Amino acid sequence: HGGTILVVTGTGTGVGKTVVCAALASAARQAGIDVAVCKPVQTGTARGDDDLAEVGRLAGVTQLAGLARYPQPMAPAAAAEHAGMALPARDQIVRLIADLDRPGRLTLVEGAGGLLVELAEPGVTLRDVAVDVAAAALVVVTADLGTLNHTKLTLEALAAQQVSCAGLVIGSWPDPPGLVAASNRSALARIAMVRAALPAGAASLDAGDFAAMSAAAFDRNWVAGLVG
Amino acid sequence: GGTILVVTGTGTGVGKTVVCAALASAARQAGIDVAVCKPVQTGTARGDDDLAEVGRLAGVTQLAGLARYPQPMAPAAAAEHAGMALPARDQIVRLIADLDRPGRLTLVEGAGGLLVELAEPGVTLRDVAVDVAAAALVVVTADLGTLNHTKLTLEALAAQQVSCAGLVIGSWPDPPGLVAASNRSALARIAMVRAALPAGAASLDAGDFAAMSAAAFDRNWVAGLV
Ligand SMILES: O=P(O)(O)OP(=O)(O)OP(=O)(O)OC[C@H]1O[C@@H](n2cnc3c(O)ncnc32)[C@H](O)[C@@H]1O
Ligand SMILES: O=P(O)(O)OP(=O)(O)OP(=O)(O)OC[C@H]1O[C@@H](n2cnc3c(O)ncnc32)[C@H](O)[C@@H]1O
Numbered sequence: 001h002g003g004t005i006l007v008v009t010g011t012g013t014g015v016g017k018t019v020v021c022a023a024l025a026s027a028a029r030q031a032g033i034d035v036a037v038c039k040p041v042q043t044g045t046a047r048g049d050d051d052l053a054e055v056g057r058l059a060g061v062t063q064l065a066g067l068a069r070y071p072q073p074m075a076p077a078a079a080a081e082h083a084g085m086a087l088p089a090r091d092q093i094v095r096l097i098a099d100l101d102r103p104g105r106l107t108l109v110e111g112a113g114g115l116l117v118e119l120a121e122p123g124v125t126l127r128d129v130a131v132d133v134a135a136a137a138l139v140v141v142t143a144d145l146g147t148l149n150h151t152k153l154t155l156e157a158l159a160a161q162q163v164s165c166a167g168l169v170i171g172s173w174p175d176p177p178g179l180v181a182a183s184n185r186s187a188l189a190r191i192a193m194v195r196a197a198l199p200a201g202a203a204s205l206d207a208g209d210f211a212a213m214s215a216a217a218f219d220r221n222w223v224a225g226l227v228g
Numbered sequence: 229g230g231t232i233l234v235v236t237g238t239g240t241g242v243g244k245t246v247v248c249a250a251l252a253s254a255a256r257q258a259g260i261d262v263a264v265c266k267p268v269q270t271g272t273a274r275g276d277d278d279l280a281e282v283g284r285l286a287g288v289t290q291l292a293g294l295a296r297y298p299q300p301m302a303p304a305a306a307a308e309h310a311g312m313a314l315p316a317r318d319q320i321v322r323l324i325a326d327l328d329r330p331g332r333l334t335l336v337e338g339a340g341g342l343l344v345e346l347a348e349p350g351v352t353l354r355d356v357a358v359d360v361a362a363a364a365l366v367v368v369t370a371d372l373g374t375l376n377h378t379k380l381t382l383e384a385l386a387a388q389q390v391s392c393a394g395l396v397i398g399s400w401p402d403p404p405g406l407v408a409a410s411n412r413s414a415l416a417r418i419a420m421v422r423a424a425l426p427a428g429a430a431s432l433d434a435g436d437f438a439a440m441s442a443a444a445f446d447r448n449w450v451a452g453l454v
């Protein structure tokens with residue numbers, strides 16, 4: 001059974017993971033692909049952080065699946081302990097994802113921060129979860145300096161667990177670029193394939209312009225190729 | 229040979245140089261002899277000079293480098309902007325092994341994070357630490373995102389059997405905050421935290437710096453390094 005499961009991870013916190021989910025969901029929806037988006041661990045609710053609500057905003061996705069939510073804008077382990085709550089178990093995240101899986105569906109799973117952040121006790125990360133559900137990983141990266149060492153460390157940690165890499169996406173592309181933010185994209189595109197570079201402030205594009213942005217941002221052929 | 233530590237970090241601008249200077253300053257006050265190698269320096273046009281920072285703050289005189297690049301980019305893009313090549317793998321490794329003598333603490337600073345291209349073709353500080361059989365001291369932040377970056381760097385080290393000498397928080401803020409103090413406890417759960425240097429230590433003069441560094445590390449560990 002199953003369709004296509006992609007963890008959408010990142011070189012760090014705040015790199016565009018959520019806008020990239022919403023852009024790839026949008027492009028896949030416009031290709032006729034059914035799309036589910038899953039955020040198993042959500043911190044920062046007491047300041048209004050809601051990555052599922054944002055994905056439904058920008059892309060209209062309705063199949064939005066959550067699990068654990070914590071008020072403080074901290075790492076999940078710290079946020080949960082600050083609230084007196086536990087992290088979810090590994091099999092609770094896996095079940096949440098497996099229930100969404102469906103032939104012909106693209107299910108996108110957003111972690112918390114970067115690849116090795118602890119999501120379930122003890123020390124269970126998005127990479128473990130990717131292993132359990134046989135998912136490949138989209139890696140959201142910046143163009144700022146530091147992006148190369150963080151990307152390489154991230155690709156290395158995936159391959160050490162045989163989690164396949166589906167490419168990279170630049171979460172915020174400034175118009176026009178600069179010498180580092182050009183040599184980086186050139187250096188990034190030498191490390192792996194840049195599936196998209198979402199214009200800066202895509203997160204503020206209204207429903208209309210986001211749909212158009214997303215369709216151009218991604219190679220319509222690559223998208224449709226992710227799911228039979 | 230003596231003791232060789234590569235002093236790496238989770239990223240750019242995390243305080244690797246001030247930590248070199250701080251550990252060199254503690255080691256000297258423990259009667260240890262210290263050398264620092266910085267094979268590739270970039271950003272010389274705006275006047276970046278990591279080895280001179282160590283000279284001033286800690287009084288090291290054995291300060292070795294191989295290449296200087298004007299543009300403030302990573303080594304590879306700095307070398308390519310200038311139309312000239314990075315040094316070669318053999319030069320860097322041999323410079324350090326020649327620096328290494330018995331009784332000496334020799335610290336090596338790359339550029340940015342562990343896996344940035346340091347020599348040609350695409351050789352990293354990790355490859356250099358393999359060749360010279362160095363351990364790695366890992367300079368980190370206490371900000372959001374440090375646990376992921378730290379775990380990513382520590383796994384990369386261990387994949388090539390380069391031993392982790394410990395963590396050092398390069399800048400400890402005043403006052404900590406909820407995130408920074410939470411991160412400090414969690415970092416300590418994944419490796420030894422040898423020091424957390426106060427924010428602004430790199431601006432101190434040599435006497436203040438030597439006093440801060442003497443208090444920042446544990447005497448026994450420093451004394452045991454060599
Ligand atoms: O938003 P954070 O806390 O970084 O959590 P995250 O790890 O899930 O973040 P992403 O990789 O998905 O990157 C995109 C999000 O960064 C958020 N963000 C961006 N700029 C911000 C700012 O100045 N202040 C607070 N949050 C911001 C913004 O809400 C994006 O949806
Ligand atoms: O100094 P950079 O360019 O970051 O390259 P690096 O790889 O050698 O960086 P380090 O980890 O060695 O140490 C952090 C540096 O950030 C420096 N820095 C300190 N205050 C700064 C400020 O206001 N603005 C920009 N950089 C600053 C600081 O002096 C350190 O040299």
Ligand SMILES: [Mg+2]
Pocket residue numbers: 016017018019051110
């Ligand atoms: Mg997000």
Ligand SMILES: [Mg+2]
Pocket residue numbers: 243244245246278337
């Ligand atoms: Mg430095």
